[PDB]
Amino acid sequence: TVLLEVPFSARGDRIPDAVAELRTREPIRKVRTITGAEAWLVSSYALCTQVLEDRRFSMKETAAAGAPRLNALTVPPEVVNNMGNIADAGLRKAVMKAITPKAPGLEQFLRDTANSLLDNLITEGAPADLRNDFADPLATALHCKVLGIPQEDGPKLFRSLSIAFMSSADPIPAAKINWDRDIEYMAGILENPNITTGLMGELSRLRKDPAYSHVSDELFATIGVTFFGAGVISTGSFLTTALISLIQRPQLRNLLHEKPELIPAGVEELLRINLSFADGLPRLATADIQVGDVLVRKGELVLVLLEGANFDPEHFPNPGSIELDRPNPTSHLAFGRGQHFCPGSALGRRHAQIGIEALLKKMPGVDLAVPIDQLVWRTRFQRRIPERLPVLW
Ligand code: HEM
Numbered sequence: 001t002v003l004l005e006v007p008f009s010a011r012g013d014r015i016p017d018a019v020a021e022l023r024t025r026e027p028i029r030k031v032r033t034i035t036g037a038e039a040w041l042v043s044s045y046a047l048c049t050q051v052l053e054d055r056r057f058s059m060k061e062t063a064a065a066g067a068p069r070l071n072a073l074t075v076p077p078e079v080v081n082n083m084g085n086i087a088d089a090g091l092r093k094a095v096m097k098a099i100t101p102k103a104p105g106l107e108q109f110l111r112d113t114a115n116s117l118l119d120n121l122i123t124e125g126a127p128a129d130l131r132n133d134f135a136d137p138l139a140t141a142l143h144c145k146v147l148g149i150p151q152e153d154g155p156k157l158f159r160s161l162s163i164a165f166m167s168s169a170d171p172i173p174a175a176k177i178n179w180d181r182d183i184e185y186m187a188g189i190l191e192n193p194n195i196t197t198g199l200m201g202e203l204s205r206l207r208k209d210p211a212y213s214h215v216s217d218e219l220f221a222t223i224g225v226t227f228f229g230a231g232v233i234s235t236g237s238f239l240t241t242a243l244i245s246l247i248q249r250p251q252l253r254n255l256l257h258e259k260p261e262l263i264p265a266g267v268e269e270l271l272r273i274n275l276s277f278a279d280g281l282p283r284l285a286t287a288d289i290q291v292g293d294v295l296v297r298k299g300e301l302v303l304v305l306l307e308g309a310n311f312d313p314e315h316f317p318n319p320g321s322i323e324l325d326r327p328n329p330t331s332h333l334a335f336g337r338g339q340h341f342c343p344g345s346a347l348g349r350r351h352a353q354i355g356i357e358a359l360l361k362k363m364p365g366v367d368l369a370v371p372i373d374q375l376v377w378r379t380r381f382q383r384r385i386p387e388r389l390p391v392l393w
């Protein structure tokens, strides 16, 4: 027998029975990654929270040369410390303020965009592909608006993502080509006088403010590339798999259609049960640290399995069921926890809430147009997503 390999399954419509067996028997245990490295896979709520809240389990140290790797880097090593670099530049407050869903008109733009996408699918007739022709275009349009960049530039930036978020054993030549091109695009945006709104408009102003005169042009461009990429891949993939979970639950679909004020609670449960992250969150130990029955040694890789935490019955009883009245509804780990908690969490919630509200109003009869087993799940990728999501209504 060989050492247990991760990831277990690229299917995003169901959790393997294996996760519950593992959490019960060995909530921290040694696995092999796709690179051949060994790692500790953590799968209980208690131990996942412990790792994420202890900064001695470091995300920037995962990029060190010679470290055991979950996958190959698709960005320059310094970008693994992206939020640390942003904070060190004095930019964290401005960046986080620009990516909230609170800017005037933003939520209306989201609703208008969702409704337009859905009207076009209704005109064309069933079947419709809710990933490529709804959820991903909605994420792309949102992030162009949030960044302040032209909508027509969205698709080209989007098409970098099927490579940029690969989970590969080896470096990916195309990832560098696309990264360098996207950095050049964002550098041009910062020099473009017509870009005055959104995140890039704000960074463009701060770039010429004496208080930021020593912040590198490379960092400013990197913020644009990285926030577009992480935001689009994360919101598009989450919404897509949330739609499957909703379609699989006609009673829930009808409840949210009938009572749209329950959509936020519904989205929070869809977040909790979401399988969009294809790999555990990686951290490198910077000291010898006890985690359950294992003494993790300095220099070892730890993988925090989000669905391990989020389906843990000790924290979320009847964990496979969507229940809108849980006492601890936001205590899931869908956005991470601790130092690296997702800075786009509010925007991600709103993207999904508006998308779902619009879908349920326009397509109350939405159902899969193919048997669920026919969905094609993307492999060796940092998200779990079906290549196409064919629906009828
Ligand atoms: C539903 C949508 C989203 C989900 C499920 C999600 C999930 C996550 C998770 C789990 C992390 C933690 C990674 C780790 O600790 O290793 C994270 C970090 C991050 N997310 Fe999100 N995210 C979403 C939306 C967004 C959006 C909209 C943006 C930007 C617009 C964004 C940008 C980031 C960035 C930059 C980080 C790194 C933060 C750091 O290292 O401190 N995400 N996200």
Ligand SMILES: O=C1N[C@@H](Cc2ccc(O)c(F)c2)C(=O)N[C@H]1Cc1ccc(O)cc1
Binding pocket: 059, 074, 075, 079, 080, 081, 082, 083, 164, 165, 225, 226, 227, 228, 229, 230
């Ligand atoms: O390595 C990082 N890189 C970017 C994210 C990123 C990755 C690849 C890209 O091509 C891109 F545009 C953006 C970031 O901000 N933080 C760290 C840690 C990290 C990784 C994955 C992740 O999903 C979220 C965070």
